[PDB]
Amino acid sequence: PPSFDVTIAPWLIARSRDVLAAPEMLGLRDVLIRSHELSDVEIPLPPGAAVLWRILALITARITGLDQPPNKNPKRKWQARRSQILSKGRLDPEAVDAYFADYSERFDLFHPERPWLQDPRLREECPKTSGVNKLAWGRTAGENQVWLGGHHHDLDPHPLDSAEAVWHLLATLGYGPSGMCTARVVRGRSERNVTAGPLRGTVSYHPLGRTLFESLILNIPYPGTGAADLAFWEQPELNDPLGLPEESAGLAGILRLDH
RNA sequence: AUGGACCGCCAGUGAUAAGUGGAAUGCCAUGUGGGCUGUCGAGCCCCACGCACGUGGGG
């Protein structure tokens, strides 16, 4: 069976502190563990990186951010723990595996159920596949002309590398076109219309440092005190199309990652 | 065979109609161009003649 894991499979290009020659691609778990070692991890698509730094800020960061500044001058104490871990200069791998451990079997995007940032049921109710060309950026869609980025005629399209596929999926989850995508029925409801992505047409500002760990630490908005939150992949069960997108005072609702 | 290769910004259009630059006005007043002065022997060749002093013909 096909399987890919963000934690173990290599997709994230990584640059080391030394030499600055031959960046190697690594998984998400490895980057997390070897963070002080690497200066940065890079994605060729700025949309892909714009959502990427958002999700990476919810993993390493969440564990370090703690999701809980109650009493004690909240802002002051989070900045105190912040100074404490910033002083350590690194994250203990055992707390990473523990986080990964909670949902270790839930990451491999190609999951039959619970695929990464995806809806698995979707396959059954949509008659026409959008196609890779409609998903991937710089790639021509059905109505798009054949002039740029290699010519894709939408007949025998060359498949995206799985690592490549991951970058695109993440971008479309951030930036995404609005109106007239392919309709899927849900108990009688068919509406090809689609609204735009949450950050669409914007510049995301991520502070950097000398090493990875620094940036990841300095990348988390301070979560105000509020309801405990979780991510789309931290959701216990699927949302369903109908109904209200519930609010989320937690930072996962402030990383625009609740839904 | 280079964020490249292939690749039109493009189809249309009066700036028009009207109009004295016009009225007046001396560049005026003065001045030698002067002295000197007669127009009176190489020249390259051919030929003819010669009293070899020199004559003439032709180019």
PDB file of C-alpha atoms (C1' of nucleotides) in Angstrom:
ATOM      1  CA  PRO A   1       0.000   0.000   0.000  1.00  0.00           C
ATOM      2  CA  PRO A   2       1.151   3.535  -0.785  1.00  0.00           C
ATOM      3  CA  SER A   3       2.339   5.481   2.231  1.00  0.00           C
ATOM      4  CA  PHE A   4       4.305   8.627   2.856  1.00  0.00           C
ATOM      5  CA  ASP A   5       5.169  10.179   6.195  1.00  0.00           C
ATOM      6  CA  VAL A   6       5.976  13.834   6.785  1.00  0.00           C
ATOM      7  CA  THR A   7       7.847  12.795   9.900  1.00  0.00           C
ATOM      8  CA  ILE A   8      10.092  10.224   8.207  1.00  0.00           C
ATOM      9  CA  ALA A   9      10.032  10.740   4.416  1.00  0.00           C
ATOM     10  CA  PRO A  10      12.407  13.307   2.919  1.00  0.00           C
ATOM     11  CA  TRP A  11      10.889  16.466   1.472  1.00  0.00           C
ATOM     12  CA  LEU A  12      12.128  19.383   3.550  1.00  0.00           C
ATOM     13  CA  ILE A  13      15.309  20.812   2.072  1.00  0.00           C
ATOM     14  CA  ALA A  14      17.666  21.527   4.956  1.00  0.00           C
ATOM     15  CA  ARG A  15      20.756  23.731   5.174  1.00  0.00           C
ATOM     16  CA  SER A  16      23.379  23.100   7.856  1.00  0.00           C
ATOM     17  CA  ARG A  17      25.185  25.537  10.127  1.00  0.00           C
ATOM     18  CA  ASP A  18      28.524  24.622   8.517  1.00  0.00           C
ATOM     19  CA  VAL A  19      30.011  24.374   5.037  1.00  0.00           C
ATOM     20  CA  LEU A  20      26.850  25.691   3.347  1.00  0.00           C
ATOM     21  CA  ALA A  21      27.246  23.008   0.664  1.00  0.00           C
ATOM     22  CA  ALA A  22      24.841  20.216  -0.377  1.00  0.00           C
ATOM     23  CA  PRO A  23      21.546  20.758   1.469  1.00  0.00           C
ATOM     24  CA  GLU A  24      19.909  17.445   2.179  1.00  0.00           C
ATOM     25  CA  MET A  25      16.196  16.705   2.145  1.00  0.00           C
ATOM     26  CA  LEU A  26      14.881  15.350   5.452  1.00  0.00           C
ATOM     27  CA  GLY A  27      11.552  14.590   7.067  1.00  0.00           C
ATOM     28  CA  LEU A  28       9.614  16.807   9.486  1.00  0.00           C
ATOM     29  CA  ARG A  29      10.617  14.738  12.515  1.00  0.00           C
ATOM     30  CA  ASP A  30      14.324  14.892  11.651  1.00  0.00           C
ATOM     31  CA  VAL A  31      14.263  18.660  11.128  1.00  0.00           C
ATOM     32  CA  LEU A  32      12.471  18.982  14.433  1.00  0.00           C
ATOM     33  CA  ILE A  33      15.121  16.938  16.265  1.00  0.00           C
ATOM     34  CA  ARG A  34      18.211  18.441  14.584  1.00  0.00           C
ATOM     35  CA  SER A  35      17.048  22.035  14.677  1.00  0.00           C
ATOM     36  CA  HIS A  36      20.028  23.766  16.312  1.00  0.00           C
ATOM     37  CA  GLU A  37      22.214  21.967  13.769  1.00  0.00           C
ATOM     38  CA  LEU A  38      20.567  23.476  10.675  1.00  0.00           C
ATOM     39  CA  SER A  39      20.352  27.134   9.882  1.00  0.00           C
ATOM     40  CA  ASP A  40      17.050  26.803   8.069  1.00  0.00           C
ATOM     41  CA  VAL A  41      14.672  24.583   6.102  1.00  0.00           C
ATOM     42  CA  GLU A  42      13.516  25.864   2.739  1.00  0.00           C
ATOM     43  CA  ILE A  43      10.573  25.277   0.425  1.00  0.00           C
ATOM     44  CA  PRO A  44      10.706  26.495  -3.200  1.00  0.00           C
ATOM     45  CA  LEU A  45       7.104  27.763  -3.124  1.00  0.00           C
ATOM     46  CA  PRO A  46       6.613  30.847  -0.947  1.00  0.00           C
ATOM     47  CA  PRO A  47       2.958  29.861  -0.454  1.00  0.00           C
ATOM     48  CA  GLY A  48       4.115  26.410   0.606  1.00  0.00           C
ATOM     49  CA  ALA A  49       6.533  27.969   3.025  1.00  0.00           C
ATOM     50  CA  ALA A  50       3.938  30.483   4.232  1.00  0.00           C
ATOM     51  CA  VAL A  51       1.664  27.720   5.446  1.00  0.00           C
ATOM     52  CA  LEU A  52       4.669  25.596   6.392  1.00  0.00           C
ATOM     53  CA  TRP A  53       6.020  28.024   8.930  1.00  0.00           C
ATOM     54  CA  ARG A  54       2.474  28.242  10.269  1.00  0.00           C
ATOM     55  CA  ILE A  55       2.262  24.464  10.845  1.00  0.00           C
ATOM     56  CA  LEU A  56       5.843  24.145  12.136  1.00  0.00           C
ATOM     57  CA  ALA A  57       4.956  26.931  14.533  1.00  0.00           C
ATOM     58  CA  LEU A  58       2.138  24.722  15.796  1.00  0.00           C
ATOM     59  CA  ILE A  59       4.298  21.649  16.422  1.00  0.00           C
ATOM     60  CA  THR A  60       7.700  22.438  17.936  1.00  0.00           C
ATOM     61  CA  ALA A  61       6.196  25.714  19.034  1.00  0.00           C
ATOM     62  CA  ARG A  62       3.073  24.255  20.552  1.00  0.00           C
ATOM     63  CA  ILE A  63       5.150  21.963  22.779  1.00  0.00           C
ATOM     64  CA  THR A  64       7.324  24.954  23.701  1.00  0.00           C
ATOM     65  CA  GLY A  65       4.440  27.438  23.745  1.00  0.00           C
ATOM     66  CA  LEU A  66       2.465  25.194  26.148  1.00  0.00           C
ATOM     67  CA  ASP A  67      -1.058  26.292  25.147  1.00  0.00           C
ATOM     68  CA  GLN A  68      -1.661  27.685  28.639  1.00  0.00           C
ATOM     69  CA  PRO A  69      -0.872  31.074  30.163  1.00  0.00           C
ATOM     70  CA  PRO A  70      -3.352  31.100  33.078  1.00  0.00           C
ATOM     71  CA  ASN A  71      -2.941  33.645  35.936  1.00  0.00           C
ATOM     72  CA  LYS A  72       0.644  34.743  36.772  1.00  0.00           C
ATOM     73  CA  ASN A  73       0.685  37.642  34.349  1.00  0.00           C
ATOM     74  CA  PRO A  74       0.091  35.336  31.390  1.00  0.00           C
ATOM     75  CA  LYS A  75       2.219  37.297  28.920  1.00  0.00           C
ATOM     76  CA  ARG A  76       4.984  37.577  31.488  1.00  0.00           C
ATOM     77  CA  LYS A  77       5.124  33.897  32.343  1.00  0.00           C
ATOM     78  CA  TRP A  78       4.970  32.693  28.741  1.00  0.00           C
ATOM     79  CA  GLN A  79       7.849  35.043  28.058  1.00  0.00           C
ATOM     80  CA  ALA A  80       9.518  33.454  31.114  1.00  0.00           C
ATOM     81  CA  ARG A  81       9.190  29.870  29.824  1.00  0.00           C
ATOM     82  CA  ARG A  82      10.148  31.344  26.473  1.00  0.00           C
ATOM     83  CA  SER A  83      13.359  32.696  27.934  1.00  0.00           C
ATOM     84  CA  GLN A  84      13.922  29.322  29.640  1.00  0.00           C
ATOM     85  CA  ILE A  85      13.738  27.236  26.427  1.00  0.00           C
ATOM     86  CA  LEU A  86      15.431  29.949  24.382  1.00  0.00           C
ATOM     87  CA  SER A  87      18.225  29.708  26.924  1.00  0.00           C
ATOM     88  CA  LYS A  88      18.474  25.916  26.587  1.00  0.00           C
ATOM     89  CA  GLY A  89      19.041  26.425  22.879  1.00  0.00           C
ATOM     90  CA  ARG A  90      17.443  23.139  21.931  1.00  0.00           C
ATOM     91  CA  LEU A  91      14.391  20.866  22.166  1.00  0.00           C
ATOM     92  CA  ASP A  92      14.666  17.442  23.865  1.00  0.00           C
ATOM     93  CA  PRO A  93      13.820  14.775  21.200  1.00  0.00           C
ATOM     94  CA  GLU A  94      11.776  12.759  23.675  1.00  0.00           C
ATOM     95  CA  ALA A  95       9.127  15.474  23.891  1.00  0.00           C
ATOM     96  CA  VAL A  96       8.941  15.470  20.084  1.00  0.00           C
ATOM     97  CA  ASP A  97       8.448  11.731  19.792  1.00  0.00           C
ATOM     98  CA  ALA A  98       5.809  12.007  22.468  1.00  0.00           C
ATOM     99  CA  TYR A  99       3.894  14.551  20.368  1.00  0.00           C
ATOM    100  CA  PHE A 100       4.468  12.452  17.254  1.00  0.00           C
ATOM    101  CA  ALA A 101       3.612   9.473  19.411  1.00  0.00           C
ATOM    102  CA  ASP A 102       0.115  10.753  20.105  1.00  0.00           C
ATOM    103  CA  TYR A 103      -0.743  10.894  16.388  1.00  0.00           C
ATOM    104  CA  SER A 104       2.142   8.926  14.887  1.00  0.00           C
ATOM    105  CA  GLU A 105      -0.093   6.680  12.819  1.00  0.00           C
ATOM    106  CA  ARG A 106      -2.195   9.642  11.632  1.00  0.00           C
ATOM    107  CA  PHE A 107       0.376  11.594   9.513  1.00  0.00           C
ATOM    108  CA  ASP A 108       1.053   9.543   6.333  1.00  0.00           C
ATOM    109  CA  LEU A 109      -0.972  11.660   3.942  1.00  0.00           C
ATOM    110  CA  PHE A 110      -2.019   8.681   1.834  1.00  0.00           C
ATOM    111  CA  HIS A 111      -4.089   7.332   4.737  1.00  0.00           C
ATOM    112  CA  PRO A 112      -7.222   5.372   3.782  1.00  0.00           C
ATOM    113  CA  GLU A 113      -8.901   7.344   6.507  1.00  0.00           C
ATOM    114  CA  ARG A 114      -7.518  10.485   8.128  1.00  0.00           C
ATOM    115  CA  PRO A 115      -5.140  11.595   5.352  1.00  0.00           C
ATOM    116  CA  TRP A 116      -2.905  14.595   6.139  1.00  0.00           C
ATOM    117  CA  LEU A 117      -4.848  17.833   5.821  1.00  0.00           C
ATOM    118  CA  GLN A 118      -7.350  16.022   3.632  1.00  0.00           C
ATOM    119  CA  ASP A 119     -10.826  14.557   3.530  1.00  0.00           C
ATOM    120  CA  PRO A 120     -10.790  10.832   2.656  1.00  0.00           C
ATOM    121  CA  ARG A 121     -14.518  10.519   2.008  1.00  0.00           C
ATOM    122  CA  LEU A 122     -14.234  13.091  -0.746  1.00  0.00           C
ATOM    123  CA  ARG A 123     -13.158  10.494  -3.302  1.00  0.00           C
ATOM    124  CA  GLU A 124     -16.491   8.660  -3.333  1.00  0.00           C
ATOM    125  CA  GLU A 125     -18.859  11.585  -3.954  1.00  0.00           C
ATOM    126  CA  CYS A 126     -17.038  13.683  -6.578  1.00  0.00           C
ATOM    127  CA  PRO A 127     -17.427  12.406 -10.140  1.00  0.00           C
ATOM    128  CA  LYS A 128     -14.675  14.412 -11.875  1.00  0.00           C
ATOM    129  CA  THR A 129     -11.191  14.514 -10.420  1.00  0.00           C
ATOM    130  CA  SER A 130      -9.786  18.018 -10.474  1.00  0.00           C
ATOM    131  CA  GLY A 131      -6.487  16.530 -11.567  1.00  0.00           C
ATOM    132  CA  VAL A 132      -2.955  17.311 -10.492  1.00  0.00           C
ATOM    133  CA  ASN A 133      -2.838  20.190 -12.946  1.00  0.00           C
ATOM    134  CA  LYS A 134      -5.726  21.902 -11.178  1.00  0.00           C
ATOM    135  CA  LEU A 135      -4.034  21.425  -7.818  1.00  0.00           C
ATOM    136  CA  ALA A 136      -0.409  22.301  -8.549  1.00  0.00           C
ATOM    137  CA  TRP A 137       0.715  25.896  -8.962  1.00  0.00           C
ATOM    138  CA  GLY A 138       2.531  27.005 -12.079  1.00  0.00           C
ATOM    139  CA  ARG A 139       0.519  24.233 -13.691  1.00  0.00           C
ATOM    140  CA  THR A 140      -2.185  24.867 -16.289  1.00  0.00           C
ATOM    141  CA  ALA A 141      -5.811  24.098 -15.403  1.00  0.00           C
ATOM    142  CA  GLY A 142      -8.659  23.002 -17.627  1.00  0.00           C
ATOM    143  CA  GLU A 143      -9.465  26.452 -19.012  1.00  0.00           C
ATOM    144  CA  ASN A 144      -5.934  27.816 -18.717  1.00  0.00           C
ATOM    145  CA  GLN A 145      -3.949  28.220 -21.929  1.00  0.00           C
ATOM    146  CA  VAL A 146      -0.848  26.129 -22.706  1.00  0.00           C
ATOM    147  CA  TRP A 147       1.737  28.907 -22.902  1.00  0.00           C
ATOM    148  CA  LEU A 148       3.837  28.664 -19.711  1.00  0.00           C
ATOM    149  CA  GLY A 149       5.811  26.428 -17.357  1.00  0.00           C
ATOM    150  CA  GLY A 150       6.089  23.560 -19.763  1.00  0.00           C
ATOM    151  CA  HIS A 151       2.944  22.796 -21.668  1.00  0.00           C
ATOM    152  CA  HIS A 152       0.439  20.528 -19.984  1.00  0.00           C
ATOM    153  CA  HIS A 153      -2.425  19.628 -22.290  1.00  0.00           C
ATOM    154  CA  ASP A 154      -4.284  17.843 -19.529  1.00  0.00           C
ATOM    155  CA  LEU A 155      -3.776  14.568 -21.427  1.00  0.00           C
ATOM    156  CA  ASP A 156      -1.351  12.161 -19.749  1.00  0.00           C
ATOM    157  CA  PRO A 157      -0.214  14.683 -17.119  1.00  0.00           C
ATOM    158  CA  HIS A 158       3.165  13.951 -15.563  1.00  0.00           C
ATOM    159  CA  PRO A 159       2.650  13.121 -11.855  1.00  0.00           C
ATOM    160  CA  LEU A 160       4.007  15.280  -9.081  1.00  0.00           C
ATOM    161  CA  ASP A 161       6.672  13.753  -6.890  1.00  0.00           C
ATOM    162  CA  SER A 162       5.116  12.863  -3.562  1.00  0.00           C
ATOM    163  CA  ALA A 163       7.366  15.365  -1.850  1.00  0.00           C
ATOM    164  CA  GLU A 164       6.354  17.843  -4.528  1.00  0.00           C
ATOM    165  CA  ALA A 165       2.734  16.926  -4.018  1.00  0.00           C
ATOM    166  CA  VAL A 166       3.030  17.821  -0.379  1.00  0.00           C
ATOM    167  CA  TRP A 167       4.208  21.347  -1.153  1.00  0.00           C
ATOM    168  CA  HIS A 168       1.305  22.002  -3.490  1.00  0.00           C
ATOM    169  CA  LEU A 169      -1.329  20.575  -1.181  1.00  0.00           C
ATOM    170  CA  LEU A 170      -0.148  22.888   1.533  1.00  0.00           C
ATOM    171  CA  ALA A 171      -0.164  25.931  -0.757  1.00  0.00           C
ATOM    172  CA  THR A 172      -3.673  25.283  -2.024  1.00  0.00           C
ATOM    173  CA  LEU A 173      -4.765  24.912   1.570  1.00  0.00           C
ATOM    174  CA  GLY A 174      -3.339  28.365   2.136  1.00  0.00           C
ATOM    175  CA  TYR A 175      -3.856  30.253  -1.093  1.00  0.00           C
ATOM    176  CA  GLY A 176      -6.611  28.759  -3.233  1.00  0.00           C
ATOM    177  CA  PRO A 177      -8.794  29.954  -6.093  1.00  0.00           C
ATOM    178  CA  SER A 178     -12.386  30.976  -5.456  1.00  0.00           C
ATOM    179  CA  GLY A 179     -15.488  30.076  -7.425  1.00  0.00           C
ATOM    180  CA  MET A 180     -16.392  27.063  -9.566  1.00  0.00           C
ATOM    181  CA  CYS A 181     -14.251  24.236  -8.382  1.00  0.00           C
ATOM    182  CA  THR A 182     -15.529  20.709  -9.090  1.00  0.00           C
ATOM    183  CA  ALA A 183     -18.754  20.062  -7.133  1.00  0.00           C
ATOM    184  CA  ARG A 184     -19.109  17.098  -4.790  1.00  0.00           C
ATOM    185  CA  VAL A 185     -22.566  16.118  -3.520  1.00  0.00           C
ATOM    186  CA  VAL A 186     -23.138  15.667   0.208  1.00  0.00           C
ATOM    187  CA  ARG A 187     -26.599  14.184   0.786  1.00  0.00           C
ATOM    188  CA  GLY A 188     -28.092  16.100  -2.130  1.00  0.00           C
ATOM    189  CA  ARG A 189     -25.986  19.278  -1.979  1.00  0.00           C
ATOM    190  CA  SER A 190     -23.966  20.261  -5.091  1.00  0.00           C
ATOM    191  CA  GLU A 191     -22.317  23.718  -5.404  1.00  0.00           C
ATOM    192  CA  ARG A 192     -19.224  24.024  -7.593  1.00  0.00           C
ATOM    193  CA  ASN A 193     -18.677  27.432  -5.973  1.00  0.00           C
ATOM    194  CA  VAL A 194     -15.756  27.783  -3.555  1.00  0.00           C
ATOM    195  CA  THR A 195     -14.522  30.640  -1.403  1.00  0.00           C
ATOM    196  CA  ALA A 196     -10.908  31.866  -1.407  1.00  0.00           C
ATOM    197  CA  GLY A 197      -8.073  30.902   0.921  1.00  0.00           C
ATOM    198  CA  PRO A 198      -7.593  32.682   4.232  1.00  0.00           C
ATOM    199  CA  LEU A 199      -4.310  34.455   3.467  1.00  0.00           C
ATOM    200  CA  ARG A 200      -4.910  34.837  -0.265  1.00  0.00           C
ATOM    201  CA  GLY A 201      -2.950  37.697  -1.825  1.00  0.00           C
ATOM    202  CA  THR A 202      -0.975  38.584   1.305  1.00  0.00           C
ATOM    203  CA  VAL A 203       2.622  38.727   2.540  1.00  0.00           C
ATOM    204  CA  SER A 204       3.390  36.604   5.610  1.00  0.00           C
ATOM    205  CA  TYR A 205       6.225  37.871   7.833  1.00  0.00           C
ATOM    206  CA  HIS A 206       8.296  35.206   9.628  1.00  0.00           C
ATOM    207  CA  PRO A 207      11.271  36.296  11.749  1.00  0.00           C
ATOM    208  CA  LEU A 208      14.464  34.296  11.305  1.00  0.00           C
ATOM    209  CA  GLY A 209      17.606  33.755  13.305  1.00  0.00           C
ATOM    210  CA  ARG A 210      20.991  32.083  13.183  1.00  0.00           C
ATOM    211  CA  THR A 211      19.637  28.586  13.702  1.00  0.00           C
ATOM    212  CA  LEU A 212      16.351  26.768  13.123  1.00  0.00           C
ATOM    213  CA  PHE A 213      15.388  26.326  16.738  1.00  0.00           C
ATOM    214  CA  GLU A 214      15.546  30.077  17.322  1.00  0.00           C
ATOM    215  CA  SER A 215      13.138  30.846  14.538  1.00  0.00           C
ATOM    216  CA  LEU A 216      10.673  28.165  15.536  1.00  0.00           C
ATOM    217  CA  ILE A 217      10.641  29.514  19.096  1.00  0.00           C
ATOM    218  CA  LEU A 218      10.338  33.132  17.968  1.00  0.00           C
ATOM    219  CA  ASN A 219       7.677  32.197  15.394  1.00  0.00           C
ATOM    220  CA  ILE A 220       4.684  31.537  17.687  1.00  0.00           C
ATOM    221  CA  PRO A 221       2.130  34.305  18.178  1.00  0.00           C
ATOM    222  CA  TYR A 222       1.539  34.631  21.832  1.00  0.00           C
ATOM    223  CA  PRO A 223      -1.709  32.753  22.425  1.00  0.00           C
ATOM    224  CA  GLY A 224      -4.034  34.774  24.559  1.00  0.00           C
ATOM    225  CA  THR A 225      -5.818  32.932  27.310  1.00  0.00           C
ATOM    226  CA  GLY A 226      -8.862  31.217  25.853  1.00  0.00           C
ATOM    227  CA  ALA A 227     -10.357  27.923  24.798  1.00  0.00           C
ATOM    228  CA  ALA A 228      -7.980  25.039  24.246  1.00  0.00           C
ATOM    229  CA  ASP A 229      -7.499  24.538  20.538  1.00  0.00           C
ATOM    230  CA  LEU A 230      -6.224  21.932  18.158  1.00  0.00           C
ATOM    231  CA  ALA A 231      -5.297  21.731  14.500  1.00  0.00           C
ATOM    232  CA  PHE A 232      -7.066  20.223  11.503  1.00  0.00           C
ATOM    233  CA  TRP A 233      -4.945  17.130  11.979  1.00  0.00           C
ATOM    234  CA  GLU A 234      -5.502  17.281  15.746  1.00  0.00           C
ATOM    235  CA  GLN A 235      -9.271  17.145  15.230  1.00  0.00           C
ATOM    236  CA  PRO A 236     -10.715  13.997  16.786  1.00  0.00           C
ATOM    237  CA  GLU A 237     -13.256  13.490  13.989  1.00  0.00           C
ATOM    238  CA  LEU A 238     -14.198  15.014  10.608  1.00  0.00           C
ATOM    239  CA  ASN A 239     -16.100  18.327  10.534  1.00  0.00           C
ATOM    240  CA  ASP A 240     -18.771  17.652   7.888  1.00  0.00           C
ATOM    241  CA  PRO A 241     -19.419  20.270   5.190  1.00  0.00           C
ATOM    242  CA  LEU A 242     -22.598  21.705   6.665  1.00  0.00           C
ATOM    243  CA  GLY A 243     -22.748  23.771   9.833  1.00  0.00           C
ATOM    244  CA  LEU A 244     -20.663  26.495  11.360  1.00  0.00           C
ATOM    245  CA  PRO A 245     -16.857  26.625  11.226  1.00  0.00           C
ATOM    246  CA  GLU A 246     -16.479  26.805  15.005  1.00  0.00           C
ATOM    247  CA  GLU A 247     -14.386  29.575  16.512  1.00  0.00           C
ATOM    248  CA  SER A 248     -11.103  28.801  18.280  1.00  0.00           C
ATOM    249  CA  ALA A 249      -9.471  31.141  20.768  1.00  0.00           C
ATOM    250  CA  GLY A 250      -6.391  28.922  20.787  1.00  0.00           C
ATOM    251  CA  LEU A 251      -3.431  29.646  18.572  1.00  0.00           C
ATOM    252  CA  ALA A 252      -4.516  26.974  16.096  1.00  0.00           C
ATOM    253  CA  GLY A 253      -7.405  29.314  15.491  1.00  0.00           C
ATOM    254  CA  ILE A 254      -4.850  32.113  15.304  1.00  0.00           C
ATOM    255  CA  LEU A 255      -2.616  30.173  12.943  1.00  0.00           C
ATOM    256  CA  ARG A 256      -5.589  29.862  10.625  1.00  0.00           C
ATOM    257  CA  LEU A 257      -5.255  26.112  10.955  1.00  0.00           C
ATOM    258  CA  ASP A 258      -8.549  25.150  12.595  1.00  0.00           C
ATOM    259  CA  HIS A 259     -10.212  24.498   9.272  1.00  0.00           C
TER     260      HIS A 259
ATOM    261  C1'   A B   1      19.036  25.835 -25.714  1.00  0.00           C
ATOM    262  C1'   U B   2      19.093  30.681 -20.181  1.00  0.00           C
ATOM    263  C1'   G B   3      11.705  31.591 -14.809  1.00  0.00           C
ATOM    264  C1'   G B   4      13.273  30.129 -20.443  1.00  0.00           C
ATOM    265  C1'   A B   5      11.640  27.994 -25.862  1.00  0.00           C
ATOM    266  C1'   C B   6       6.603  29.431 -29.251  1.00  0.00           C
ATOM    267  C1'   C B   7       4.817  34.775 -28.656  1.00  0.00           C
ATOM    268  C1'   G B   8       1.391  41.386 -32.716  1.00  0.00           C
ATOM    269  C1'   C B   9      -1.966  45.751 -28.170  1.00  0.00           C
ATOM    270  C1'   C B  10      -5.395  46.306 -31.881  1.00  0.00           C
ATOM    271  C1'   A B  11      -9.651  47.429 -34.941  1.00  0.00           C
ATOM    272  C1'   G B  12     -11.917  53.915 -35.367  1.00  0.00           C
ATOM    273  C1'   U B  13     -11.530  59.311 -35.699  1.00  0.00           C
ATOM    274  C1'   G B  14     -11.741  67.609 -39.564  1.00  0.00           C
ATOM    275  C1'   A B  15      -9.509  71.007 -34.490  1.00  0.00           C
ATOM    276  C1'   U B  16     -12.938  73.752 -35.758  1.00  0.00           C
ATOM    277  C1'   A B  17     -15.426  78.716 -36.970  1.00  0.00           C
ATOM    278  C1'   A B  18     -14.084  84.728 -36.730  1.00  0.00           C
ATOM    279  C1'   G B  19      -9.981  89.065 -37.396  1.00  0.00           C
ATOM    280  C1'   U B  20      -6.199  96.742 -40.367  1.00  0.00           C
ATOM    281  C1'   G B  21      -0.984  96.903 -36.701  1.00  0.00           C
ATOM    282  C1'   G B  22      -2.615 101.632 -37.149  1.00  0.00           C
ATOM    283  C1'   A B  23      -1.528 107.128 -36.970  1.00  0.00           C
ATOM    284  C1'   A B  24       3.641 111.381 -37.443  1.00  0.00           C
ATOM    285  C1'   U B  25       8.787 112.293 -39.352  1.00  0.00           C
ATOM    286  C1'   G B  26      15.223 116.805 -44.020  1.00  0.00           C
ATOM    287  C1'   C B  27      20.963 113.056 -41.738  1.00  0.00           C
ATOM    288  C1'   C B  28      21.953 117.750 -41.979  1.00  0.00           C
ATOM    289  C1'   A B  29      26.343 121.585 -41.975  1.00  0.00           C
ATOM    290  C1'   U B  30      32.190 121.734 -44.031  1.00  0.00           C
ATOM    291  C1'   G B  31      36.441 120.165 -48.244  1.00  0.00           C
ATOM    292  C1'   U B  32      42.907 120.463 -54.382  1.00  0.00           C
ATOM    293  C1'   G B  33      44.669 114.394 -54.804  1.00  0.00           C
ATOM    294  C1'   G B  34      48.225 116.823 -55.018  1.00  0.00           C
ATOM    295  C1'   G B  35      53.272 117.752 -56.902  1.00  0.00           C
ATOM    296  C1'   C B  36      57.812 114.460 -60.665  1.00  0.00           C
ATOM    297  C1'   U B  37      58.634 111.652 -66.150  1.00  0.00           C
ATOM    298  C1'   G B  38      61.869 110.474 -74.821  1.00  0.00           C
ATOM    299  C1'   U B  39      59.284 103.789 -75.338  1.00  0.00           C
ATOM    300  C1'   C B  40      63.977 104.089 -77.874  1.00  0.00           C
ATOM    301  C1'   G B  41      72.282  92.084 -80.089  1.00  0.00           C
ATOM    302  C1'   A B  42      71.913  82.950 -78.268  1.00  0.00           C
ATOM    303  C1'   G B  43      67.137  81.346 -80.776  1.00  0.00           C
ATOM    304  C1'   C B  44      66.573  74.682 -81.620  1.00  0.00           C
ATOM    305  C1'   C B  45      66.112  72.455 -86.918  1.00  0.00           C
ATOM    306  C1'   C B  46      65.824  71.550 -92.405  1.00  0.00           C
ATOM    307  C1'   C B  47      66.740  73.721 -97.221  1.00  0.00           C
ATOM    308  C1'   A B  48      68.332  77.354-101.133  1.00  0.00           C
ATOM    309  C1'   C B  49      72.207  81.531-101.740  1.00  0.00           C
ATOM    310  C1'   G B  50      76.721  83.534-100.369  1.00  0.00           C
ATOM    311  C1'   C B  51      81.934  88.072-101.338  1.00  0.00           C
ATOM    312  C1'   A B  52      81.581  82.452 -95.000  1.00  0.00           C
ATOM    313  C1'   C B  53      80.862  89.346 -93.465  1.00  0.00           C
ATOM    314  C1'   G B  54      76.513  87.445 -93.713  1.00  0.00           C
ATOM    315  C1'   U B  55      70.546  86.816 -96.962  1.00  0.00           C
ATOM    316  C1'   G B  56      66.487  84.460 -97.604  1.00  0.00           C
ATOM    317  C1'   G B  57      62.636  80.176 -97.499  1.00  0.00           C
ATOM    318  C1'   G B  58      60.116  77.056 -94.378  1.00  0.00           C
ATOM    319  C1'   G B  59      58.754  74.655 -89.590  1.00  0.00           C
TER     320        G B  59
END
